[PDB]
Design a binder for this molecule. Sequence first.
Ligand SMILES: O=c1ccn([C@@H]2O[C@H](COP(=O)(O)OP(=O)(O)O)[C@@H](O)[C@H]2O)c(=O)[nH]1
Ligand SMILES: [K+]
Ligand SMILES: [Mn+2]
Length: 243
Amino acid sequence: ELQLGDIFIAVKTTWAFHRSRLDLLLDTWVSRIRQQTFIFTDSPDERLQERLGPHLVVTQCALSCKMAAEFDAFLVSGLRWFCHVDDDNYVNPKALLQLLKTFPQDRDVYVGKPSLFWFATGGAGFCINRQLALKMVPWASGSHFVDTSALIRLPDDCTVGYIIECKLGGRLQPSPLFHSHLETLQLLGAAQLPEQVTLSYGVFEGKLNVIKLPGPFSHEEDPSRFRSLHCLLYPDTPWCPLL
Ligand SMILES: O=c1ccn([C@@H]2O[C@H](COP(=O)(O)OP(=O)(O)O)[C@@H](O)[C@H]2O)c(=O)[nH]1
Ligand SMILES: [K+]
Ligand SMILES: [Mn+2]
């Protein structure tokens, strides 16, 4: 009974990455789940506002103010599930939906890839359902009637985890399906790739960490491998090459 319509996907970006990162996501995974996808940025953009309308949220800025903006928008949506990703993440919404279907519908869930209290690495993507997110509000909002002294010098992903685990007695559910680029991604190939919820690209430990796909785009045309991934997942896409 859970549908794609029940999911609110929030992407964090910034103006300086509109051309270099965001356009890549719009041609790719965001094109398959645009109704559920919200891009949070810090400056307007003609191309994006064209392709996105109210799905481009430009913020004019406990949690950072783009992250607060994502949570507030999610809560206003009324949707059951919040999933946050960065602008170097690829999301497979069909894999996402199947993971989310796996949770009891009346329990608080926080799911993602653990990191060190436990927390879900922001760069791998993570999801929270509405009933948990509503319990987080007093801390997430920086309210004067909770202790947020521990929270002020934590990054957003650790803050989310701290609120959930240390303030609300909750637990991160780990999933191996979420991936950041703080991870040797080259250990995921065309066999594992369609089952993953998120993939990533980026430099880590002096290396450009990317998924292992031979094509169909060259590394020079598609250094992230996201276009190639996208073509693997949706071979009907007319701009896909052969190899
Ligand atoms: O000034 C900035 C720099 C980065 N980002 C966002 O923060 C996330 C991580 O950025 P990046 O991948 O460059 O940082 P890193 O992975 O090195 O931590 C991405 O969603 C970016 O869009 C941002 O909102 N403002
Ligand atoms: K914080
Ligand atoms: Mn990154």
